[PDB]
Design a protein around this ligand. Structure first.
Ligand SMILES: [Zn+2]
Ligand SMILES: [Zn+2]
Lengths: 50, 107, 50, 343, 50, 46, 66
């Protein structure tokens, strides 16, 4: 059987800024669920995404 | 339910343990750290908030000799309680003394 | 009331840290008003929306 | 001398032109050569004193001497966030026809401080939308605005044309639940201020609602905090390294707050001395002057705090500090119980 | 907006989301915070096994 | 029981039950506003 | 629209000073003397009255009435 579970901690999830000039503009991250509405990541990864 | 959980460091026989004080913040953390650091048998003590969304502090204690870290932590709580008991008795004396002086003047 | 300082590391790139007590008292409290409209017409035949 | 520098380093926060120095607390065992900074309850109980220097309605200023920043800041934080009060959480609205939006009106009514003593009430449980005598109060606001049957022909100003065109917090009537009407004498359960504008009306408009005050701490929402502001400052000790005489004494008395430097005549000659360094706000005007940067040592005594607790009216500030100290005693008591439960 | 660029070489895909981004230095560099409202929608088909 | 609508210009009850063209009874204004609900609504004071 | 009940920065009740503040300005106090007479020491409270616009006094003309 197939259970369509919710996204949970440790899912591999793709993350991408809209204009992509190089391959590092799309990378895969491990999801962690948190209450507030925004997407959040450590600011060391701001330079690849611009 | 439980507010306290103990997480021993992997290599260390009970002289290094992290205390997860639940439903707490910097208010107990910095005050309790101060009383533990006043104990000469403590080597390292310090707290971190795991996340601003989470009301936990990881209080780490490491002790010099063989003594288990539960003993500095318990002495830390008791001495802080005795300080706050003595602060209260002095404060309430000074309020009553101030009110009695002000009522004794201009009468 | 702005303090210009570096606080908590959640303010690396233009992000700004707000005060919870100020927001509770009404700083930045706003209202959003939206429309909804409906038209009931009388047709060429003698019939009508209702 | 090295010893004199160590003593300043462990007892005075010194203020430079470009930054404060000696900020951290250092009197811990093994930080110093000969000093024995281990905990000693008798040395604490000897040095500690409390001096209440001012107190009136809704305000209090007092000095704590011999306590550390890590404990004085705990008292500051409890008074802001962890001392409970009674404040409106639910508003049941019947026929609101004012221009003030219901969500805005409910927010305003939340922030009104209620005179109810919060020790006599319990926390309302999870769920439990009704509540009871033990854990809620109730208020009823009901105002109808109408035209004044008589008015002068000019008719210019609202205060003649209309009646009840301003809603004030005095329109809140307490509605007793259960035996509360006997436990509280009349006038004890009231809004504090008696003059807070809530809405503002025009004739034909009406407000009728029902409030439910419950108990909560200030960490939850900021309408529960009992203090206008609670803060402290370390005490200044501005000291004169060289005697400042002549007409430099006058310009040294203007580089400070208006009551700290006095200029006195000893032989028909003006010499300056520090008189009341408590009143200084440290605007650091002695460093704009070029000749007098090198005769003063702006500093702060580390273990001497000057608390300033201004209450909002729920309960007087001497009871607020006593309640705040008990909360930190209660936090320590709870974890002692769990060390006993595990072991 | 023709077939070859608009619908063949690139195309709209489901199991996708978009939100404002904001900083969080307490996450690791390989992690991303996903809000609960997106996590309840974005499902992954987990095949049932031992 | 009959629906009552409140005139925009003069705040007068018109009771437009019948399928007549919208028009105020006392004045020529042709815009009507519904009255507020009788049922209670509870708001969190936050 | 209408004067806030509490100062955003510290929570002093400034919401009852408004009808006094306009009254003192009829007696030709300056703004800096009028706020000092009401007890607003800190400047975060002072800007509540100093920067306020009394919009509800003007929205209530357009508002419907009998
Ligand atoms: Zn009409
Ligand atoms: Zn203020």
């Amino acid at each position: 059987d197939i259970v369509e579970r919710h996204l949970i901690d440790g899912d591999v999830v793709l993350f991408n800024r809209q204009p992509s000039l190089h391959k590092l503009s799309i990378m895969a991250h491990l999801a962690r669920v948190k209450p507030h509405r925004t997407f959040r990541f450590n600011e060391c990864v701001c330079t690849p995404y611009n | 339910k439980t507010a306290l959980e103990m997480v021993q460091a992997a290599g260390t026989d009970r002289h290094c343990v992290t205390f997860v004080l639940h439903e707490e913040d910097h208010t107990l953390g910095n005050s309790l750290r101060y009383m533990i650091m006043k104990n000469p048998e403590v080597e390292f003590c310090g707290y971190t908030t795991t996340h601003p969304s989470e009301s936990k502090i990881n209080l780490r204690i490491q002790t010099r000799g063989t003594l288990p870290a539960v003993e500095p932590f318990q002495r830390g709580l008791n001495e802080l309680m005795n300080v706050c008991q003595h602060v209260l008795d002095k404060f309430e004396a000074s309020i009553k003394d101030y009110k009695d002086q002000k009522a004794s003047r201009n009468e | 009331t702005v303090a210009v300082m570096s606080y908590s590391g959640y303010d690396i790139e233009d992000a700004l840290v707000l005060n919870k007590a100020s927001l509770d008292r009404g700083f930045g409290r706003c209202l959003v008003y939206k429309n909804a409209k409906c038209t009931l017409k009388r047709y060429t035949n003698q019939t009508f929306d209702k | 001398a090295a010893s004199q520098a160590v003593e300043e380093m462990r007892s005075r926060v010194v203020l430079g032109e470009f930054g404060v120095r000696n900020v951290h607390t250092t009197d811990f065992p093994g930080n110093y050569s000969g000093y024995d900074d281990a905990w000693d309850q008798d040395r604490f109980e000897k040095n500690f004193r409390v001096d209440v220097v001012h107190m009136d309605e809704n305000s209090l200023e007092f000095d704590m001497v011999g306590i550390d920043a890590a404990i004085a800041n705990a008292f500051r934080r409890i008074l802001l966030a962890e001392v409970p009060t009674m404040a409106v959480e639910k508003v049941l609205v019947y026929n609101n026809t004012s221009i003030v939006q219901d969500e805005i009106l409910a927010h305003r009514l939340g922030l009104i401080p209620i005179h109810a003593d919060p020790r006599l009430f319990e926390y309302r449980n999870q769920g439990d939308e009704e509540g009871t005598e033990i854990d809620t109060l109730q208020f009823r606001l009901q105002v109808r605005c109408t035209r004044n049957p008589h008015a002068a022909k000019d008719s210019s100003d609202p205060n003649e044309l209309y009646v009840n065109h301003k809603v004030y917090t005095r329109h809140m009537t307490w509605i007793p639940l259960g035996n509360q009407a006997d436990l509280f004498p009349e006038g004890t359960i009231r809004p504090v201020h008696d003059d807070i504008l809530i809405a503002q009306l025009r004739p034909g408009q009406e407000i009728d609602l029902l409030m439910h005050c419950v108990k909560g701490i200030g960490k939850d929402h900021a309408k529960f905090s009992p203090v206008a502001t609670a803060s402290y400052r370390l005490l200044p000790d501005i000291t004169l390294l060289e005697p400042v005489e002549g007409e430099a004494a006058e310009e040294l008395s203007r580089c400070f707050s208006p009551g700290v430097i006095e200029v006195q005549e000893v032989q028909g000659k003006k010499v300056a001395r520090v008189a009341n360094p408590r009143l200084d706000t440290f605007s650091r005007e002695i460093f704009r002057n070029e000749k007098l940067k090198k005769v003063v040592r702006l500093a702060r005594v580390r273990d001497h705090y000057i608390f300033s607790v201004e209450s909002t009216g729920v309960l007087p500030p001497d009871v607020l500090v006593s309640e705040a100290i008990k909360v930190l005693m209660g936090k320590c008591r709870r974890f002692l119980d769990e060390l006993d439960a595990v072991q | 907006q023709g077939r070859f660029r608009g619908n063949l070489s690139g195309k709209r895909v489901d199991f996708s989301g978009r939100t404002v981004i904001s900083p969080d230095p307490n996450l690791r560099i390989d992690e991303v915070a996903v809000p609960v409202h997106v996590a309840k929608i974005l499902t992954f088909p987990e095949k049932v096994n031992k | 029981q009959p629906m009552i609508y409140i005139c925009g210009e003069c705040h007068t009850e018109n009771e437009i039950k019948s399928r007549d063209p919208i028009r105020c009874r006392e004045c020529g204004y042709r815009i009507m506003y519904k009255k507020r609900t009788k049922r209670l609504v509870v708001f969190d004071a936050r | 629209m209408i004067i806030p009940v509490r100062c955003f920065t510290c929570g002093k009740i400034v919401g009852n000073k408004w009808e006094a503040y306009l009254g003192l300005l009829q007696a030709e106090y300056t703004e800096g003397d009028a706020l000092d007479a009401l007890g607003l020491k800190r400047y975060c409270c002072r800007r509540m009255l100093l920067a306020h616009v009394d919009l509800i006094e003007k929205l209530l003309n357009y508002a419907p009435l009998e």
